[model samples]
Target: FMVSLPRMVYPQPKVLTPCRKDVLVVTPWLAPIVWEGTFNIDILNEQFRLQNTTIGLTVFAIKKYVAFLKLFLETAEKHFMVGHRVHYYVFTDQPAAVPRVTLGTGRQLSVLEVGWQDVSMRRMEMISDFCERRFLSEVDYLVCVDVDMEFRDHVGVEILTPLFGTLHPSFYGSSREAFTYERRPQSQAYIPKDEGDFYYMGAFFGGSVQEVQRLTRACHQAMMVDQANGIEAVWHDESHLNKYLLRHKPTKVLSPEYLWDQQLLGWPAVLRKLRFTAVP
Candidate 1:
């Protein structure tokens, strides 16, 4: 039974323009609440991809999540180099965090009324339609990411240049312990005991505008297939992404600074584990 998807409109950026690919990088706007620094890179200042870029959010995650989202945007704005302009694409059903975005800098954000496919289908197809048809349509690259993280110091420095293009920059990589389904121990997706270094620390990921189109389509397809199998992992867009990327590794491999796992606060394993022991 093929169902026709509804007619949709993607959001377009009003304040910025896409100049060139090798010179620009867009960080997803769902930043963490902690950490801070400046974003004054001589090279990145050449273009302001941040300004009109989109940042996704969800009402389904609850209002408390907004704390991280708020902190992320506030901290993010402070780091911008003079020429780097960034905007946000905030998708949600309810409007809890929307207020903070509106109150801050004359900077603008585009709000789209998108249904959370249960975080089910990594909604890249939906977003691509939105990004290409609606916002930042002419931009060279777009970053797909999560709302619970932040930009590590000097992210603008390493990326935002020709070097960014060289990296098989698939999963704006980060560090953190591997996550698990504790419930389904035998699952193929299960990570072994300390088997993996990081299970996708947060929601931040990046890629080329064209590559993003590919990613969105691929993830959406995988999510559909996963759902059919009865194990649709929402929020683990990272998971679906991990699969897609493994098959088609981005030309680059990024570390935490690209998407820092600050959950460690740079601590040794034991110390870091002790601090967040109460969490989970």
Candidate 2:
């Protein structure tokens, strides 16, 4: 079973061997989702609208520990090779007002707009939108991460970029092959008593643009069927994505250290630069 987090799937770097010295990477957003206050969604929405912050284009900015993204981007510039123009897909209510983002690399950032949905509502929709609609087509290596992660040291982008036949490393799920379960009977997404293991960690997922894009529409279509059937689960979008990928393909599992959380493990881990990479 896959546990999907609305975050990044950091892969292991150089374990497969240091392939490249310089690397190009893509973040969901270029600017940090620096907002104040709690997740009173109402206030969050108001801020989101005011900032004209694009969700997937400029940044998937939210109130979580987003400062990590700022530093992550910084580290990418410092360690990885940032030659090509990395397109940060920001989906905001309005458009972002900020200009170009040069992560110390010669590359300039471009902004694209994906319409805003109540993150609650759109969570399920992002997969379909990105897949069928070609959300990540423009990017060479697509990093599907949440805004709340940091890099410890210098990680080569080539470590976690797309591989031909493999899924990127993930941290949220127990193993690449996991099965999701429903927690309660009343719960909209409660798991049935009988089920098998499925693999997934929704937090961070990366892959070749073409390979990942192939499943976008299919993923969305599956969810559309669930919606039409009036089935609702807390994991909604995440569940849909997890189950879909679980049956369809083999997902690569990354080291949990790649996606450590402050509350879970704390700061000492933050200083180590762990790059989530693809395996050959």
Candidate 3:
């Protein structure tokens, strides 16, 4: 059960008027495809804050990746879930190298030393392992992301949901046939060319603690099965993530704004805000 919101004055939603005229705002399954004009941050903030929600942001910085942490952490402080309580969990091989970035009033950070192989694939296993010992008790939601990126705009409670995936910036407008999905039938992450709703980037994805745990656990198990048979997915963890999301649809889907590479693929007319982007 949830408490009712207090009376507040804001622009009323018009029935016939669409928030976004150029883009698709809702999935066929009715899940919201988050965009700039689609939501009012003031309303979302109050609703989430009322519940005293705590968000746990997970990022892995191993070896040379540790250098990117300073900028990543600094920019995050400027953006990301500002008013709400936030717990930043940074998994690194070199814990001492992790920079000390100033956090806001309700924000905190944790450094966990972890092992890595194919760092991308290992992330699912590491995240799943930590869920039982750390995340379940610490936060309401878990946002798993890559450390080689920075937040350039608002990434607030609008992204919080049961489960969500960000569209791959390069493949957002491309057809399923052109998506770089794992094609080999021998691998556990294999997805046929004809099927796929969206090509979700592995760099950023999250959900409620339970849902995130489930996703990581499932992906880890699948990867293990593939390893046992001496088969590896084409895109490693990302392939498995796409397959998982296909079977168990996400509650919401973030637009490419949530994950972009301005250097590789320059900004287009579609992206109004580049919230989290790759750092060169």
TM-score of each: 0.56, 0.54, 0.98
lDDT of 2 by residue, 51-156 (tens): 3322222245443333344554555455433333455554434344433335543344443444522355453355445443454444455555554455543322
Candidate 1 per-residue lDDT, tens place, 1-280, comes to 3333444444443346532222223333222211112222332333334333332221122346545556555555554221333456666655655555433444455555555455555256566554565534534445444556553333342333211222112222333233432223332233335444333422444455566667667667766666566675534455655545444544443433344343444433321111111011
lDDT of 3 at 175: 93
Residue 10 displacement (Å), model 3 = 0.7
The ten-residue window of minimal lDDT in model 2 covers: 30-39
lDDT of each residue in 164-280, candidate 3, tens digit only: 999999898899999999999998899998899999999999999999989999999999898888888878899999999999999999999899999999988888999999998
Question: What's the TM for model 2?
Answer: 0.54
**Model 1 quality (TM-score):** 0.56
lDDT score, residue 24, model 3?
93
RMSD of each: 13.2, 14.7, 1.1
Error of 1 at 157 (Å): 6.0
